[PDB]
Amino acid sequence: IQCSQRMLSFSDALLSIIATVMILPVTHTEISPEQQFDRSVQRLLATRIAVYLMTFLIVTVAWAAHTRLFQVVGKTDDTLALLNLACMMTITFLPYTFSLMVTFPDVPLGIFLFCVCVIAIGVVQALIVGYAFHFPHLLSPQIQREPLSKERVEAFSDGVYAIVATLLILDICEDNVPDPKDVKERFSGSLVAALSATGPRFLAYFGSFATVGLLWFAHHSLFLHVRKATRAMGLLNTLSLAFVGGLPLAYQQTSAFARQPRDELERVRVSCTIIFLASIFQLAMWTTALLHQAETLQPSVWFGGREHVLMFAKLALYPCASLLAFASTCLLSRFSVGIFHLMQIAVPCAFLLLRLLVGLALATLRVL
Amino acid sequence: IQCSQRMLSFSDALLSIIATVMILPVTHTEISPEQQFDRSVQRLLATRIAVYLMTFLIVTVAWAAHTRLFQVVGKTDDTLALLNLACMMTITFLPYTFSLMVTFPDVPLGIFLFCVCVIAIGVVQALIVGYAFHFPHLLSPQIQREPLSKERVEAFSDGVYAIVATLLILDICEDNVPDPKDVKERFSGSLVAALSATGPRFLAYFGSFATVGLLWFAHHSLFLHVRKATRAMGLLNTLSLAFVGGLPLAYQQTSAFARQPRDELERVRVSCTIIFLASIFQLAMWTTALLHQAETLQPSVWFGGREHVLMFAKLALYPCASLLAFASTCLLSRFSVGIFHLMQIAVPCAFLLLRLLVGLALATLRVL
Ligand SMILES: [K+]
Ligand SMILES: [K+]
Ligand SMILES: [K+]
Ligand SMILES: [K+]
Ligand SMILES: [K+]
């Protein structure tokens, strides 16, 4: 009998990428200036965002069902591996059916194909269960004779984060790659001078990537001290990942969404809201785990623990900064863009010096 | 001190996706019929293919250096995690510099940025080494006082395979999603009738996905019996993955490459060549491991072992079928397309029945 760890890792990667794909249409929404005040186009954009959210949630539900199934199964086999590949294929077919239904919501074809795909997933998983139970040695020892699998959650989250960070660089690679017919005209053939138009732009990439990379760093930190992953924690993680997938929306440059008519205040508000939603659910995961620390958290991060305050600050850094920037957009709009840039530059430094800042604050409050 | 396994998994995912991204420009090659006989466009397409190969190899070299580094380090830390994030950011910046150099190969800007990025990677890794050695408890026990890390190779391969399988479905989602203004004209508003143009197309997806999914299944099988991963095996795996990344080229539909002028024989030959190159290097990995079976392979797959013939057949199935199809394109061109479709339908069945076919063949040869 074979060890199923790599097969489950492959499934996690596939499903995470599949869930995150549907943000691409959102980033490719073109709004002409003539349609800036057209409510129909704005409604279409909102509908496409809702479609992305629904598809992410559906793929996550399928992934959770798969996780249940292969917690029940445990071991794998050639036949089981091929059946898992068939299940992954059927699941990956879901975005196509959902897109077809979106294009023609009033025709039965989309609903019919979606139902057929769901039934196919069900039948494939039932076949997997039947094969596993027909050979008892392929079952988990407890079954051979609820909690979530932490590694599956971590792999799914890593896939989502990596895909977002990749979409950023794909956007950059197209933003600032001029052609000879463009450089010879805009800059009289001096490519170096094109830095004046491209220098800052790719520099902005460094700011965006960090925002994702540090968010993962928070997640990576939290689950280093997580013992038991509860279903509520899984749901909160799913919401956090769903809102993480929208970071390219607030950070991409070539994206049609980025080229829509807008103002600085609106863009800053949207980016701050997306970051706040992404991070507040990680903070909610941590708070939820704190209620049952005895069974969900390592002793170091329990109340009064050595790592407690550090973890709390690490997870609350982004929500507080995002909320402060959003408030500044309303109270100090004239300098809100500068404050947002300052936040982008400072939050990584705060993460780097976090262990010193926390101790300094603790000592200052103790003496005072 | 923290466990570095998840950080390395995240790095593997990032680097694998980054390596595979550069196939997207290749799939977006638009060749008008007026330029079918224009040698310049064909040369440009070949140059972009070579650029994709070079970028994949460079990203793989960076990933291998990172693997060496964090085999030396072993344990991780908050500062080490942030430094690893910085290193990943610098590495992800490589595609942008390579693309800029490609656009203007005769200007120093591209080479200058590429050199700056490489030096940045070097300095970041040197800082990681210095920090790790300044705190001896963050070093591996042997160092605290060559072989490859199998899990890193497996994670990188899984990332590449998942990205290819995802690119397939992204192509499909755009191939066969008509709009009302298109359905009302081409099919008089009968969306169901559009199956006549869309039915087979997404059906073809099922054929393409399997081809990737089974290739992974072969890889997944081989490394289940691999003890020690040698550097030569790593190089062969890198070549196999590089040629796997070109599967969307031979299987995508909307891709401008797919819409280029062509003939059935040429497309079949290209697809067969790509599949053959992808699988022959897995077979080469297996053969290379066989030379040092005592140190690289589990006893079950040694010469004369129970699983030996099964593994050999599993890894040689695709190369033989691809070579036979390619030969048919020259000897039986009139039926080569049908033979290719038959191969696409049959190879999964051969994989499913492999354990029976191998035994049947062995018995038949023994009695005869
Ligand atoms: K994993
Ligand atoms: K992944
Ligand atoms: K892994
Ligand atoms: K992956
Ligand atoms: K992509």
Numbering used by the authors:
A (entry chain B), B (entry chain A): 30 to 174, 254 to 476
Paper text:
Transmembrane protein 175 (TMEM175) is a potassium (K+)-selective cation channel that is evolutionarily distinct from all other known ion channels. In mammals, TMEM175 is expressed in lysosomes, where it is critical for maintaining lysosomal homeostasis. To begin to understand the mechanisms that underlie TMEM175 function in lysosomes, we determined the structure of hTMEM175 by cryo-EM and identified two conformational states. hTMEM175 protomers consist of two homologous repeats of six TM helices, which assemble into a dimer to form the channel. A 2-fold symmetric ion conduction pathway runs along the center of the dimer, lined by two copies of TM1 and TM7, the first helices of each repeat.
The resolution of the putative open state improved from 2.64 to 2.45 Å and the closed state improved from 3.03 to 2.61 Å. In the closed state, the isoleucine constriction formed by Ile46 and Ile271 is too narrow to allow ion permeation. The side chains of Ile271 point toward the channel axis, narrowing the pore to a minimum radius of 0.2 Å. For the closed state, we can now model three ion-binding sites and 25 water molecules into non-protein densities. In the cytosolic region of the pore, where the channel undergoes minimal conformational changes during gating, the K1 and K2 ion-binding sites and water molecules occupy almost identical positions to those resolved in the open state. In contrast, there is little correspondence between the ion and water configurations at the isoleucine constriction or on the luminal side of the pore due to the conformational changes that occur to the channel during channel gating. The inward movement of Ile271 displaces the ion-binding sites on either side of the isoleucine constriction. Movements of Thr49 and Thr274, which both coordinate water molecules in the open state, result in a movement of the luminal K5 ion-binding site toward the luminal entrance of the pore. Thus, the higher-resolution structures reveal how changes in the protein structure alter the ion conduction pathway to prevent ion permeation in the closed state.
